Amino acid sequence: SVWQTTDYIALSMVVYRTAIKLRNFVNIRGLTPTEMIVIPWNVMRFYCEYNTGTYGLSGNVHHKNYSMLLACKAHRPTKVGYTLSNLILTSDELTTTTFNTSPYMIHSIDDQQCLSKVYPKTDTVWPVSSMRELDYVASTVSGDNAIIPSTIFNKNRYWKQGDDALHFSHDLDLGFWFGSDYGNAYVPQNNDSMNAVGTIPTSKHINVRGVNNRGMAGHYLSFPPIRTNDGQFKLNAQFTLETEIEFEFRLWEQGVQGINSVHTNLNPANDSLWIQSYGSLVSITESKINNIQFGPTCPRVDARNKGGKMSMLFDHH
Amino acid sequence: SVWQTTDYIALSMVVYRTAIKLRNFVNIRGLTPTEMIVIPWNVMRFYCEYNTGTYGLSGNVHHKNYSMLLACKAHRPTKVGYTLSNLILTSDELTTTTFNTSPYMIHSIDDQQCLSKVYPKTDTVWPVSSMRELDYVASTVSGDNAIIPSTIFNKNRYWKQGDDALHFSHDLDLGFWFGSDYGNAYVPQNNDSMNAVGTIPTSKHINVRGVNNRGMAGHYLSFPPIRTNDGQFKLNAQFTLETEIEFEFRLWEQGVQGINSVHTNLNPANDSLWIQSYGSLVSITESKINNIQFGPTCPRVDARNKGGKMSMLFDHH
Amino acid sequence: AIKLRNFVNIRGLTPTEMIVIPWNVMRFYCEYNTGTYGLSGNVHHKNYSMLLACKAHRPTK
Amino acid sequence: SVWQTTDYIALSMVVYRTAIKLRNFVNIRGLTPTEMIVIPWNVMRFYCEYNTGTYGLSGNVHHKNYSMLLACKAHRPTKVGYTLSNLILTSDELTTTTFNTSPYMIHSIDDQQCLSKVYPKTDTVWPVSSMRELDYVASTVSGDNAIIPSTIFNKNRYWKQGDDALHFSHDLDLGFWFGSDYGNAYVPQNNDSMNAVGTIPTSKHINVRGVNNRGMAGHYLSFPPIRTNDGQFKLNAQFTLETEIEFEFRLWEQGVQGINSVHTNLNPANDSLWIQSYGSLVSITESKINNIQFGPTCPRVDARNKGGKMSMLFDHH
Amino acid sequence: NAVGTIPTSKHINVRGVNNRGMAGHYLSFPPIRTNDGQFKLNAQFTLETEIEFEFRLWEQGV
Amino acid sequence: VGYTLSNLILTSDELTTTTFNTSPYMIHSIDDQQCLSKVYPKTDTVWPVSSMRE
């Protein structure tokens, strides 16, 4: 038996799991039956950054568990999800607003991807600081036609006062980690719109390449068209938004390799094999979201092209 | 039953296995505790070409089984390995050198890849003809810090006189073969540094592409720092180097296709599907190695991104 | 954990004097003070600089 | 336990097996019932070298597996065989040639060795480049008598359109190997005509000596005599010639002994014990075969003098 | 390669994989010599081809 | 995808008038080793795409 030193790999490979859970009240008002609320639930900033009211305008809204994930060697988003809860419906009438139980708010999931990319209304804009209170309104309009959102979208839940909460989750299986901040990136997705790895593959070695089409369908809030004598009912909704994003993180190398002064020199170069930049960004100019891309996991994609391990390790020339 | 001719595929697919086993004495001298011996065990030339003493300077040092593999249609490196055996430790004192049992020589495997790329010492150079007697010395130095190699490297065996031999093997599972000489190439590896296939993928058909990160960690020889009144003990080591590389080779097409005169014309064009040039070369100017890249199989890479079949067959546009 | 490995050379120690193992000091385990390192700069392990980004940390074993 | 180095014998003794399979169409025309086609199936050049049409005239017709066997340390012919298949019989009438099913082509094996040595017809010659398309015609003639070949030869198969293919194999058990090219040699045979080892035994040591009478009988193609009003039917035949020769080969010495530069010096001298030159040559002047010797394994030779191991290791003084 | 669409950047594309191809099929006649030249051999046969398609319909709804 | 060759009728042209003969055969060759990677028409011959099935 030849004597050998302790293992430094075991502790560098141990995966730690954390989450960021944030809760919010949402007031949806002034939404006509043609326009819909766009749930930016495919954006990393939605889950781990609290943009509501004065917060998003004020200062650093990042959760402290995330600012810590940036002190880790690597972090990975894994599961992500949100819950719509405790719906309160109101009508504006003519103007004073009161409660009514009979209506419903329509939660729409766009699985067939009727809407590939979604823009704000003409005079409307989408502040990134307003993200969590769900104010992003899109008016779906054909050439002369005004689409009713609930009619095109595959999954439409009519959600009523007293109904149970609406839970929506998305699992991420990434073969790779992230070493930097998300920075108004979508949650990692392999789509027609976007890919999960952000690092440009460089030649003469293996790189991380996205694989298999894991994406999130567009989630949309809408109200049923109900006609008054003149025009439509103005239906309003309050509910509770609870989001959760579950991170995996991983620590620094054991030994002298992980010493602050010499880690700059001794940092592994093959971190590029498992450590990646965030893949695709939401389109942002100033603080305002230009459009939101969705790109669900397509049900008509071959089932063999859908499944685990969103990335593979693939050479480049 | 329609009559049909004999099968010519069976004999073209039969895989034959050979090895090249070479044995060598190694004398490591003048190695301070800061500098380390770099085992060029990731280089094809290390196993199948005998570079020692006058041989490497003299003439053709290739083993004859390899010169035959070049008469095959295809050959593939498969397993590769070396054995360090029968360690003899000596000290230089002041100058006359004598035997001492108590010290040890440190064999270091760099799994975490503290050292991505390794250069010779400033005045030192790395002759490619000196490869098998392990004289390649690297001085690991931080900005003001002189690294002790054993302290950063993950696996460090302290190997003593009388200890059993040190065996190190690397299996290669290649989905492809090679039709040419290695030519100062690393053994096929999928790394941050290097990829196993050398053929540039060309458009409008499938090409061989490296996959899954199979690489070899840096192997390093070092001595423990032991202080004299002035300076360090000068520790020297002899041992036996037995290397083995196990080749698979494959023969020519049966039938008229494999006739010398018409095989030039009738050589299959889809050889490009299973026949490849060697992927990545050691950096050589003149006869001297500029640097040695290692790129281990990374333990923090996803286990699903590590495993068999170092290549896949993938289209190009 | 923070695992650090080091070579130690004890020299010039008479039988009356002894080497004091500072193994009761936190700085001994999680900070690498050897050779030029301790003189050079920040010798703290990076897992510790992260523990300071945690809400709480505790030394245990 | 005394430590010892790895074994270099095991890999030098491993025997690898290959074959050369070649397929050919044969057109036998203008063969009278007195003359016969001589199947040069006892010639090495018949199996491993493709002499047909323009090939034999053009250039290098050797199969590439054979050019590789010459890069081996040793190679050995072992089994050899050919298949006659898919017979098509035609008649020339008066001149235009048409198909007829009723005749047959006679395949004759000369076991009793009626014909020891076989010469071409007076104006006919036997190009070595014409070997595989079976055009070598011999006219068997006694003093005043014209022999009908089928009548003297022991085994005569009357082979008809629609009959199954004619398979003929010959196994070789050689106690020795070959290090050079066959070079218009017969396949190794111990005969009245020929012996399998080509190396002249040299004095004061053991040499390889042929033993036991393994030989191949003369194979002959002929047509039955069928009389017209004036003369004979002119019967013609097409069939498919598939030949196969199965080689065993063996690789170079492991270790420094098998290094290109020093193998010239360190080549074993006792290769002369198992490595031999080819025994007996077909008689060739220019490109033309002078005669073909057959020398079957004689059925009236003692059965104890027939059997395995065509050679023994025998001293010389 | 089987896919004709040029892969475009910043998303996933369909890429061909695994080498499925069809060998060359060839019709030929055996060489059979006349007095001068070869037999001219001719052939009639019946060619029945079949290609089996899968198809898929349009999206339901509006 | 697939095709079937069926009911072979072999004839010879002789000298010119063409007649039936059973004894020959037509060779169907599948090139698995890909002796021929790419195949061109004969020099004076061309390959009309409208002639494909015969």
GROMACS .gro file of N, CA, C and O in nm, chain A residues 255-265, chain B residues 142-145 147, chain C residues 2 4 27 30-34 36-50 52:
model
  160
  255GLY      N    1  -0.800   2.241  -0.070
  255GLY     CA    2  -0.657   2.248  -0.080
  255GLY      C    3  -0.608   2.387  -0.111
  255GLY      O    4  -0.680   2.486  -0.106
  256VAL      N    5  -0.479   2.393  -0.143
  256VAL     CA    6  -0.417   2.519  -0.177
  256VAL      C    7  -0.476   2.576  -0.305
  256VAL      O    8  -0.473   2.697  -0.326
  257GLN      N    9  -0.535   2.491  -0.389
  257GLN     CA   10  -0.600   2.540  -0.510
  257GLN      C   11  -0.710   2.640  -0.478
  257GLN      O   12  -0.735   2.731  -0.558
  258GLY      N   13  -0.775   2.626  -0.363
  258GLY     CA   14  -0.884   2.714  -0.327
  258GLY      C   15  -0.847   2.828  -0.236
  258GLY      O   16  -0.933   2.886  -0.170
  259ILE      N   17  -0.719   2.861  -0.229
  259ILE     CA   18  -0.673   2.976  -0.153
  259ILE      C   19  -0.693   3.102  -0.237
  259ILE      O   20  -0.664   3.102  -0.357
  260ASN      N   21  -0.740   3.209  -0.173
  260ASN     CA   22  -0.776   3.331  -0.246
  260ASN      C   23  -0.665   3.379  -0.338
  260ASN      O   24  -0.689   3.409  -0.455
  261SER      N   25  -0.542   3.388  -0.287
  261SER     CA   26  -0.435   3.449  -0.366
  261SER      C   27  -0.395   3.361  -0.483
  261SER      O   28  -0.373   3.411  -0.594
  262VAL      N   29  -0.384   3.230  -0.461
  262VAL     CA   30  -0.337   3.141  -0.566
  262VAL      C   31  -0.449   3.079  -0.648
  262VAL      O   32  -0.422   3.014  -0.749
  263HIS      N   33  -0.575   3.097  -0.607
  263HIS     CA   34  -0.685   3.043  -0.687
  263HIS      C   35  -0.699   3.116  -0.819
  263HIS      O   36  -0.744   3.057  -0.918
  264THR      N   37  -0.664   3.245  -0.822
  264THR     CA   38  -0.663   3.316  -0.949
  264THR      C   39  -0.574   3.246  -1.050
  264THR      O   40  -0.608   3.236  -1.168
  265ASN      N   41  -0.459   3.197  -1.005
  265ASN     CA   42  -0.365   3.127  -1.091
  265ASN      C   43  -0.405   2.982  -1.112
  265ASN      O   44  -0.397   2.929  -1.223
  459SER      N   45   0.353   3.094  -0.842
  459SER     CA   46   0.249   3.196  -0.841
  459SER      C   47   0.316   3.333  -0.858
  459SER      O   48   0.431   3.342  -0.902
  460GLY      N   49   0.245   3.441  -0.830
  460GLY     CA   50   0.304   3.571  -0.856
  460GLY      C   51   0.434   3.594  -0.779
  460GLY      O   52   0.539   3.609  -0.841
  461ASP      N   53   0.428   3.595  -0.646
  461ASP     CA   54   0.548   3.586  -0.564
  461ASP      C   55   0.568   3.449  -0.502
  461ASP      O   56   0.671   3.426  -0.437
  462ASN      N   57   0.474   3.357  -0.520
  462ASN     CA   58   0.475   3.231  -0.447
  462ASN      C   59   0.534   3.120  -0.532
  462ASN      O   60   0.509   3.112  -0.652
  464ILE      N   61   0.492   2.742  -0.564
  464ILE     CA   62   0.404   2.634  -0.524
  464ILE      C   63   0.486   2.508  -0.501
  464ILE      O   64   0.579   2.477  -0.576
  636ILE      N   65  -1.265   2.292   0.501
  636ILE     CA   66  -1.146   2.347   0.439
  636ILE      C   67  -1.033   2.251   0.471
  636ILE      O   68  -0.994   2.237   0.587
  638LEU      N   69  -0.641   2.161   0.399
  638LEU     CA   70  -0.516   2.219   0.353
  638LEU      C   71  -0.402   2.126   0.388
  638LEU      O   72  -0.401   2.066   0.495
  661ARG      N   73  -0.716   3.034   1.262
  661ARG     CA   74  -0.632   3.070   1.149
  661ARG      C   75  -0.546   2.954   1.102
  661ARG      O   76  -0.500   2.954   0.987
  664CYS      N   77  -0.814   2.716   0.849
  664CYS     CA   78  -0.884   2.775   0.735
  664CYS      C   79  -0.803   2.881   0.663
  664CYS      O   80  -0.854   2.944   0.571
  665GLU      N   81  -0.678   2.901   0.702
  665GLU     CA   82  -0.593   3.002   0.642
  665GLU      C   83  -0.455   2.943   0.625
  665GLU      O   84  -0.401   2.884   0.718
  666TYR      N   85  -0.398   2.958   0.506
  666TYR     CA   86  -0.279   2.881   0.469
  666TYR      C   87  -0.160   2.974   0.484
  666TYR      O   88  -0.128   3.051   0.394
  667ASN      N   89  -0.088   2.959   0.594
  667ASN     CA   90   0.027   3.045   0.624
  667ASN      C   91   0.150   2.956   0.613
  667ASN      O   92   0.183   2.883   0.706
  668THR      N   93   0.219   2.968   0.501
  668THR     CA   94   0.333   2.883   0.473
  668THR      C   95   0.423   2.958   0.378
  668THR      O   96   0.374   3.027   0.289
  670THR      N   97   0.604   3.165   0.134
  670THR     CA   98   0.579   3.300   0.087
  670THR      C   99   0.432   3.339   0.098
  670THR      O  100   0.401   3.459   0.102
  671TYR      N  101   0.342   3.242   0.107
  671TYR     CA  102   0.198   3.270   0.108
  671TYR      C  103   0.161   3.371   0.215
  671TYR      O  104   0.110   3.479   0.184
  672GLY      N  105   0.183   3.336   0.342
  672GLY     CA  106   0.147   3.425   0.450
  672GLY      C  107   0.204   3.565   0.436
  672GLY      O  108   0.141   3.663   0.478
  673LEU      N  109   0.322   3.577   0.376
  673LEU     CA  110   0.381   3.708   0.354
  673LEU      C  111   0.319   3.778   0.234
  673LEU      O  112   0.318   3.902   0.228
  674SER      N  113   0.266   3.702   0.138
  674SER     CA  114   0.234   3.757   0.007
  674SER      C  115   0.104   3.836   0.007
  674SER      O  116   0.099   3.947  -0.049
  675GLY      N  117  -0.001   3.784   0.068
  675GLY     CA  118  -0.134   3.833   0.038
  675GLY      C  119  -0.241   3.749   0.104
  675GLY      O  120  -0.219   3.689   0.210
  676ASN      N  121  -0.358   3.746   0.041
  676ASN     CA  122  -0.475   3.684   0.102
  676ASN      C  123  -0.459   3.533   0.093
  676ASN      O  124  -0.469   3.474  -0.015
  677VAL      N  125  -0.439   3.469   0.208
  677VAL     CA  126  -0.419   3.325   0.216
  677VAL      C  127  -0.543   3.251   0.258
  677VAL      O  128  -0.537   3.130   0.280
  678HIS      N  129  -0.654   3.321   0.275
  678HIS     CA  130  -0.778   3.256   0.316
  678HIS      C  131  -0.828   3.164   0.207
  678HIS      O  132  -0.815   3.193   0.088
  679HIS      N  133  -0.886   3.052   0.248
  679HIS     CA  134  -0.947   2.962   0.152
  679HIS      C  135  -1.076   3.024   0.101
  679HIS      O  136  -1.141   3.101   0.171
  680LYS      N  137  -1.112   2.991  -0.023
  680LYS     CA  138  -1.228   3.057  -0.081
  680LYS      C  139  -1.359   3.007  -0.022
  680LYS      O  140  -1.457   3.081  -0.025
  681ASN      N  141  -1.362   2.885   0.032
  681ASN     CA  142  -1.483   2.842   0.101
  681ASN      C  143  -1.509   2.925   0.225
  681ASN      O  144  -1.624   2.938   0.266
  682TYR      N  145  -1.405   2.981   0.284
  682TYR     CA  146  -1.429   3.064   0.401
  682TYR      C  147  -1.481   3.201   0.362
  682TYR      O  148  -1.575   3.251   0.423
  683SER      N  149  -1.420   3.264   0.261
  683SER     CA  150  -1.470   3.391   0.212
  683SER      C  151  -1.615   3.382   0.171
  683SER      O  152  -1.685   3.483   0.168
  684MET      N  153  -1.661   3.262   0.138
  684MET     CA  154  -1.802   3.238   0.111
  684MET      C  155  -1.884   3.225   0.238
  684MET      O  156  -1.996   3.277   0.245
  686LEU      N  157  -1.858   3.386   0.486
  686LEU     CA  158  -1.887   3.522   0.527
  686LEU      C  159  -2.000   3.584   0.446
  686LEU      O  160  -2.053   3.687   0.487
   0.00000   0.00000   0.00000
